[PDB]
């Protein structure tokens, strides 16, 4: 669906924009809400007028790229599943690792 | 909230004082009950006097405040204290003035709760106080009109103080006639017409009427308030029983006729059906009103306005009675007589013939059955009269060539076409008598009676010619003289008319179908008046039923005729009744229920109950089936109670036909035929949509006779744009053919649905109400409960006369023309206090006249507010006239 | 899509049919040729008193003895008038006497239709002008009134009206205005016809009149002169 | 108070007891009769029931064979997709049978008691159609020459066929309504159809085209056939702008579905059978889109442009609109007409509308000349930019 | 007042009275409805049996038949049988049929589809009229079309003009085209249908004009009704690349709107609210007058006015007056109503995060800061001049 995106700012954004509209006003359940509509995207290009402005969305989140801390914290919980040999620093493996993801 | 406060001098603390008795007052509750008895009178006066001033001020102040839900229970608890020993026990001079704000405590309760049970209760308690006050009440209403501190609530509420009078527990003439009813009527159209109807305070109103008219004119709309009182009286039939009720209808008719506004008076008179009432209407209006106005002219016009049945001026019991009333009334003998005389309404019809033309397609197609069918069609296209005069004048082509039953029938129908001629219809009749078989000659006699009616007031009448005819031996010639005599007069209480019927009507069964019609005709003579009776009809009816009832058409007419003859009051009837009673049959039993209604002089509460313990949907062969269908329809009932109540009644009547149909397999086919006649009589709310909807289904379904009845009423609007609807309906009529028998019913249906341009449809009510009553329509209805039609049967159907006179615009005061009038258009409806609804103009221009048609032109109104006048006669043109009432002897309205 | 340059099956161009409509949008101007002179009348139709009524012009001079009233888009006409001023004096340099109503009108009309929306020079029109001009003056030949159209059809008239009332007014002129009606009567005829398209009654701040009469040059009528014709309409 | 309280509780209570009667008598499940027209309708259906019509399963005749059993034999295929070899009944008369048309067969013994009515294959098209309603000429704007021209084409031959035959000229079939919107192309089409008093079929261009390719061929084919069989049909093909477009293919879906309806209408019209008893009226805002086949005569005999009116015509739209209104006649109809020239029919009705908006705010029941003047100067300046006409008139 | 009350009591009585009188008395009578009528109903139950095959009535034909497609995946030609009325039934209803011989016994079923449920989204606004700051008049012109014929139709009919339907809400967006649509709906208290325009363009081909027809049907019955079509502009500009409908599908759907509005078939008292950011990208006929009567431009709310709306906002997200109310307002130069919400909504989030229930000055400054990344404040308008 990369073709939907460059075509006119997403067919997938179309679904998000409508759900966001429905959720903005609906029945007597405008007052209380426990159903959110969440978007994952990685571009700012796709963003139509309702998405772009704040006080229409509760938050726009910017993610911090994977750092040296993040590799450790993820590595540590992972390493438990297998057998390990004593005297291996979890700190050492993460720090060398340049990653690109978890 | 603050406790007490009518014990504190400032006008502001009065407003919490009203709420305060919910908790209780500090001094004010004890002052009135306990202290008044306990402590001496002289000492009390100090306490009371300071309290009186506040209590009075407070009354205008309470009205000024807007609560009715916080206001209402709080002042009501306080009311008990005053009643105990402040009513008239305190002293002699002080209570009378103290009762004046007391009245106020009760009024809010009277008003808020607008039911009839609260009205009653509220009245019993209020009337005793009134008598104690001895005229403090009239002054109280006066202050209210001014408004010291009031500004809203007092407009509904003050009317209620008047409402209190009705009970008359102790009130003789201490306020029952005039206590400012006239301001109270003028502002509030609602509550006063009810109070007015019951009290017969309405009598005083006649005296007032000149003064009241001034308010009526264009300052306020009083015209609406008068129109309202009639609505309540007709509805009051169901509320309170008919014997209690008859005196009430009679009382309102005297006041309505005297007061200038005639349309309300005619509705009540029509319901009563008596001899006395009709003469009076002319003379009363003249003497009370010193100025000529509309008032003199009304006596004539009311006759014209009234739509019962058949020939022009309608009932014509009134027209025969008018010949010396006309003389008393005097706005010019010569003029008044010429206009009143049917020559003037006939004359306008003639002028109309040229523009009108003929819009269907004629046929006088020589020889065969085709000839006989064709003769029928001629009358049918108009459904009355139009420019058929040219076709009919040639005798030779249609009439002479017709064979058998066809000659009688064609000849019979010929008078109904030629009605609305004074002479030149007559010449044609005289010729046909001379020529050919006995049949043309016999149908011609009936025809003479109708034509001659175009001039009367002892100006060449119907009676003179018909009397000689009555002797004739043949059963067909006899029928023609007697049927023509009931058709023409349509009400008579002249000696000569009654005596001629007396030794004839010796028939009780005959081969000829049309001979049964003689009974209807004798009953027809009775209508519109009290009893002298004619013995022969009464005797023959019971005898006929036992003897034959196999011919359904024949059978229907004889019991109906019996009830109609009885109608009215008198002791002449008492003598023949003894003779009738000695014989008792199961057969007589149904006829008797109709008589109860008749006897009383119009009923509607007695009628109502009887229609529940009904003869409806009942037979043993066709023994009880004689009156059963006629009863079920309850058309007479629907129209009788208000135009407003009619809407509902109509839906129920339809529902009722459906009910008779489920019950009997046979009744289903009849129930379909019954709908066209029902609709036609009734003047329904469901007017356009319904007959057409049925009509289409009936093409597809067998029985062509269904289309033929349905078509009488379905023709509806006459072409302005209605041509598209008529032509489409007509197309369906034409297309169908499969036999001659089949073809004859369709052929008639096609030509009836069509109408010549700017003629009119059917009407049986007066055109400012849905109340009416015909006897003319019972005849086609009876002969069209059969399967198919015959040449014989066809002749009765051809008549649908009770149609309009061609004036529906400016009856005027020195006009009486066909020529149009200024009208304005409003889509508006805001009223519910008018005789059939009429809106207020904004004075914006549209094409001349209200529609000459029997429907439409109802929200299209008169402009008489650049004339600065008020209409008596409400604008409609269903049958209505646009005339207005001024102090002036003539309306100075503009023409266009 | 289809172009606008194309001929329709009716047998006319689209751009031009629109331009006639543009003439219909504006204010009405009447130009009457009388043989006593040529009067041009135009409606000001002001809606505010803060305006200065002298500077609302819709009569502009082609020449010093030819006046012109213009109708439809006021702006679109102004360019044609700018080019006209240069030609009249130019005509004086070459001929050594002043330009005629006929000569000036045929030369502006050539420019009126030239339109080629794409692949046409920027020194030439992409679209025609929606203005109708009325050139009214008296010149060496005598009083002449020539009418020019946005379709570039020029014709000689004696009474012509253009603007919103153009068809209505033109019919109505043919009736009252003839050559058995004098110049002052032409001014009265124009004033009556003017009122339906106007939002208000006729006034001396709601008309502008100028007459060019024989032996005289172009005169713009002063407040007194406007007021004398207002008195009797 | 008491009397009314009592009557409310009582009446309601009576409906509960009555409940057995409510269902039989009024309807709303379990007998929906009043037994004046149903006594007849039921009666006729019963004889059918008893032998072999009901349950009548809809099927259609695929082919007429004479193989297996009797000489009359037909292969019908039911709408469950199984074929059956069936007989033919004289038990009740077959009346509408044609090869390929729907026919009815029984589930107990599969034989044709009665064929289904002519070409009811789309039930979908038939339901939406109005049949000749009455539209007054107090809302069909103007007097105008523009109105009159269409009528000669549409109304006169249907109203009277008499004339055309006598001379020996062929009668009108075709008219093209073309011009920008808001000129009441729809508005007039309706009015004259009732005036003529012939059957009115309006159909939307969008409804002809539906999901699958060749589904669009089924609805159009069967609509034209249905039209021909009935007595006098006018099919008013409503508003085809891109739902009528010229044949092309993009290889993703293409113009295929759109052209499908278009082409179907061409195949039955010209065909090897000509147009039957079918008159055609086209509404297009774009003739620029249409196929060369449609634009030539034999369904488009005369082209008439109903477009933006003339200067005199705009005054006539004011006069017709005023009749509907209950506003002053002291308001000059003409003044409004000059103040807004180059205005379509829709725009002149918005002026009246606007005039009313100013009027309600002020709290008047009647519109004024003041409100009116204001309404036209706002229309000439503002409304022009939005208006449909510059782009649609270029295509026209 | 008194005459009205008695009339109503009578009307109610007459339906009841008549129906009842004929029945019970005919049970006493020896020939009319009596036994038969009670039996007829019993007889429908026994004839139908169990089970009953369900159908949907597409149309009734006047020939003693109807087209009801049975739930078995084949079509049936039903006859008026088992005591039923042909004309009584209105199209589109689900009906019960006797399986044993095809007859419509009666009508009661609808068997509810999810498509109507999606359409009907009732109102309950965030903010609404009379809690919105400045430009009071701008709302009142809108009311002319939407609100005012619902509140009083009387004024319009009496005047005699075409009842105003259709409005275009245009201008640069930040004024609350969405807010105004919600606000009018609460005030009028009429049914609120909300369908977003993007939803018309579907992944299915040719469903779009069908979905319009249904929208308007659902509105007519509901009516007086308001329909808010949020953002009509979205379908024309965009090609989602979820369909092969193309430019053609948009064009057919836009057209179907016109037909349903006035057309050959009108839909009674359905007003349309079109929010749009632009008027030049829209289809020509859709924005032509006489499908709208009122055209209004929203310019952005004034810098003074931003202050009067803010007090209200701060109070809603707990009142503090320790805030620099003026600074937050100032930096942002004449732009969206949306930014005022963002600054309060965020600040309150931050306060909670800090672990308190009171929003303070520091929280207001912080939220503001986060909002400048997310939007661009009002720095665009500043750069130009």
Short mmCIF file of N, CA and C in Angstrom, two decimals, chain E residues 87-128:
data_model
loop_
_atom_site.label_atom_id
_atom_site.label_comp_id
_atom_site.label_asym_id
_atom_site.label_seq_id
_atom_site.Cartn_x
_atom_site.Cartn_y
_atom_site.Cartn_z
N UNK E 87 -52.50 -3.49 -0.86
CA UNK E 87 -52.23 -2.07 -0.94
C UNK E 87 -51.81 -1.62 0.41
N UNK E 88 -52.09 -2.39 1.41
CA UNK E 88 -51.91 -2.01 2.78
C UNK E 88 -50.43 -1.88 3.04
N UNK E 89 -49.61 -2.89 2.52
CA UNK E 89 -48.18 -3.00 2.61
C UNK E 89 -47.46 -1.94 1.80
N UNK E 90 -46.42 -1.36 2.49
CA UNK E 90 -45.63 -0.34 1.90
C UNK E 90 -44.33 -0.96 1.52
N UNK E 91 -43.67 -0.59 0.43
CA UNK E 91 -42.42 -1.15 -0.06
C UNK E 91 -41.34 -1.14 0.91
N UNK E 92 -40.40 -2.07 0.79
CA UNK E 92 -39.15 -2.30 1.44
C UNK E 92 -39.22 -3.08 2.74
N UNK E 93 -40.45 -3.33 3.25
CA UNK E 93 -40.65 -4.13 4.44
C UNK E 93 -40.37 -5.64 4.30
N UNK E 94 -40.01 -6.37 5.41
CA UNK E 94 -39.87 -7.82 5.37
C UNK E 94 -41.18 -8.36 5.82
N UNK E 95 -41.58 -9.45 5.19
CA UNK E 95 -42.91 -9.99 5.30
C UNK E 95 -42.77 -11.46 5.62
N UNK E 96 -43.80 -12.09 6.15
CA UNK E 96 -43.85 -13.48 6.52
C UNK E 96 -44.72 -14.14 5.53
N UNK E 97 -44.15 -15.29 5.02
CA UNK E 97 -44.82 -16.08 4.09
C UNK E 97 -45.05 -17.47 4.60
N UNK E 98 -46.19 -18.11 4.28
CA UNK E 98 -46.50 -19.52 4.50
C UNK E 98 -45.75 -20.31 3.48
N UNK E 99 -44.95 -21.30 3.93
CA UNK E 99 -44.07 -22.04 3.03
C UNK E 99 -44.81 -22.98 2.17
N UNK E 100 -45.85 -23.61 2.68
CA UNK E 100 -46.54 -24.72 2.12
C UNK E 100 -47.17 -24.34 0.81
N UNK E 101 -47.72 -23.10 0.72
CA UNK E 101 -48.16 -22.52 -0.53
C UNK E 101 -47.77 -21.07 -0.36
N UNK E 102 -47.05 -20.49 -1.36
CA UNK E 102 -46.55 -19.11 -1.15
C UNK E 102 -47.69 -18.09 -1.08
N UNK E 103 -47.81 -17.38 0.12
CA UNK E 103 -48.81 -16.42 0.46
C UNK E 103 -48.15 -15.54 1.41
N UNK E 104 -48.40 -14.20 1.46
CA UNK E 104 -47.97 -13.27 2.44
C UNK E 104 -49.10 -13.27 3.43
N UNK E 105 -48.81 -13.82 4.61
CA UNK E 105 -49.71 -13.90 5.80
C UNK E 105 -49.85 -12.57 6.41
N UNK E 106 -48.69 -11.79 6.40
CA UNK E 106 -48.63 -10.53 7.05
C UNK E 106 -47.27 -9.95 7.10
N UNK E 107 -47.20 -8.79 7.71
CA UNK E 107 -46.04 -7.91 7.84
C UNK E 107 -45.77 -7.69 9.32
N UNK E 108 -44.53 -7.92 9.78
CA UNK E 108 -44.09 -7.42 11.05
C UNK E 108 -42.61 -7.27 11.13
N UNK E 109 -41.85 -8.03 10.29
CA UNK E 109 -40.44 -8.26 10.28
C UNK E 109 -39.86 -7.00 9.63
N UNK E 110 -38.59 -6.66 10.05
CA UNK E 110 -37.74 -5.79 9.26
C UNK E 110 -36.47 -6.58 9.14
N UNK E 111 -35.99 -7.22 10.22
CA UNK E 111 -34.78 -7.95 10.23
C UNK E 111 -33.52 -7.16 10.13
N UNK E 112 -33.46 -5.93 10.73
CA UNK E 112 -32.49 -4.86 10.77
C UNK E 112 -31.07 -5.03 10.24
N UNK E 113 -30.76 -4.28 9.20
CA UNK E 113 -29.44 -4.25 8.60
C UNK E 113 -28.47 -3.25 9.33
N UNK E 114 -27.11 -3.51 9.33
CA UNK E 114 -26.13 -2.63 9.93
C UNK E 114 -25.95 -1.36 9.09
N UNK E 115 -26.46 -1.21 7.84
CA UNK E 115 -26.14 -0.02 7.09
C UNK E 115 -26.78 1.25 7.71
N UNK E 116 -28.06 1.18 8.18
CA UNK E 116 -28.77 2.31 8.88
C UNK E 116 -28.14 2.73 10.15
N UNK E 117 -27.55 1.77 10.91
CA UNK E 117 -26.87 2.04 12.13
C UNK E 117 -25.69 2.85 11.91
N UNK E 118 -24.89 2.66 10.81
CA UNK E 118 -23.67 3.43 10.62
C UNK E 118 -24.03 4.94 10.45
N UNK E 119 -25.07 5.30 9.68
CA UNK E 119 -25.57 6.58 9.32
C UNK E 119 -26.05 7.40 10.48
N UNK E 120 -26.77 6.77 11.45
CA UNK E 120 -27.40 7.51 12.45
C UNK E 120 -26.35 7.61 13.58
N UNK E 121 -25.75 8.78 13.72
CA UNK E 121 -24.78 9.09 14.76
C UNK E 121 -25.40 10.22 15.37
N UNK E 122 -25.87 10.10 16.68
CA UNK E 122 -26.60 11.18 17.31
C UNK E 122 -25.64 12.25 17.80
N UNK E 123 -26.21 13.44 18.14
CA UNK E 123 -25.47 14.62 18.52
C UNK E 123 -25.18 14.57 20.03
N UNK E 124 -24.24 15.37 20.59
CA UNK E 124 -23.96 15.62 22.01
C UNK E 124 -22.66 16.49 21.96
N UNK E 125 -22.70 17.78 21.59
CA UNK E 125 -21.51 18.58 21.28
C UNK E 125 -20.54 18.76 22.46
N UNK E 126 -19.26 19.03 22.23
CA UNK E 126 -18.23 19.47 23.14
C UNK E 126 -18.45 20.84 23.69
N UNK E 127 -18.55 21.75 22.76
CA UNK E 127 -19.00 23.10 22.99
C UNK E 127 -20.07 23.34 22.00
N UNK E 128 -20.97 24.31 22.26
CA UNK E 128 -22.17 24.55 21.50
C UNK E 128 -22.50 25.99 21.66
#
